[PDB]
């Protein structure tokens, strides 16, 4: 009752890892000529409005893909309370830093001319991509400071300082990619994020590059967790962000001087 923001039941890891969210999803689509500023769109979104409005999401492919490597995040994401636009781009060609732009464009359309804008806060808004749309992110995250939550999944970027940064940022990179390997991207993408900004970064134990394409337990789980905390401000996420064991009903208190 307190947070204003809060939808659905107390969460727990089942139903994280679950396939589906407490929410119904419906779907519309706006067309590549429609879309000012990117290439269309499929938008996922909770079909009840009956507990409030939710935060959107716009989630960008990688270089030469479309939607339907993303595809698979729009039902997982939306079931859980949010607008999502898994978007294409203007070609599949474009690099990092167009595909911010189009990110950006793609919110605005979702908030002004959409057909389920009156179930968007224009207020709590987020973005998440694959690859080139993970620096995509990035870069979208550095220029718009009024974003909520960013979620570059493998990204990739010839530029590695983000201290710019101030969006809540969690770095999905993959232990055996070979196409924006972890030493050179994702890793320096975190380290050079700055202390002050809530961030976090996540490694997939034996992932290539193509993990983020398929349905993915840890993946869905953590951006769930991740989005929840920080376009809802949902503290009720926050036990698997930062486990501890007062996590637990028969613990008040505890403390430690860990990691031991
Ligand atoms: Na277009
Ligand atoms: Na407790």
Redesign the pocket.
């Known amino acids: 009752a307190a947070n204003p923001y809060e939808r659905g039941p107390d969460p727990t890891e089942s139903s994280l890892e679950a396939s589906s969210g407490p929410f119904s999803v419906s779907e519309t689509s706006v067309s590549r000529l429609s879309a000012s500023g990117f290439g269309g769109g499929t938008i996922y979104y909770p079909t009840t409005t009956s507990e409030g409005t939710y935060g959107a999401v716009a989630i960008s492919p990688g270089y030469t893909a479309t939607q339907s490597s993303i595809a698979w995040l729009g039902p997982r994401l939306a079931s859980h309370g949010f607008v999502v636009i898994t978007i294409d781009t203007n070609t599949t060609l474009d690099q990092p830093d167009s595909r911010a732009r189009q990110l950006m464009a793609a919110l605005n359309y979702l908030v002004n001319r959409s057909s389920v804008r009156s179930r968007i806060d224009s207020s709590r808004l987020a973005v998440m991509g694959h690859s080139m749309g993970g620096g995509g992110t990035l870069r979208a995250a550095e220029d718009n400071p009024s974003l909520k939550a960013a979620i570059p999944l493998t990204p990739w970027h010839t530029n590695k300082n983000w201290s710019s940064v101030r969006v809540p940022t969690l770095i999905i990179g993959a232990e055996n990619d070979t196409i924006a390997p972890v030493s050179s991207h994702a890793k320096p993408f975190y380290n050079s994020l700055p202390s002050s900004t809530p961030k976090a970064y996540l490694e997939l134990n034996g992932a290539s590059h193509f993990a983020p394409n398929s349905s993915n337990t840890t993946i869905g789980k953590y951006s769930i967790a991740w989005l929840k905390r920080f376009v809802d401000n949902d503290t009720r996420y926050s036990q698997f962000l930062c486990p501890a064991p007062?996590?637990?009903?028969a613990?008040?208190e505890y403390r430690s001087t860990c990691p031991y």
Do not use: E, L, R, V
């Open positions: 007062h996590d637990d009903s613990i008040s």
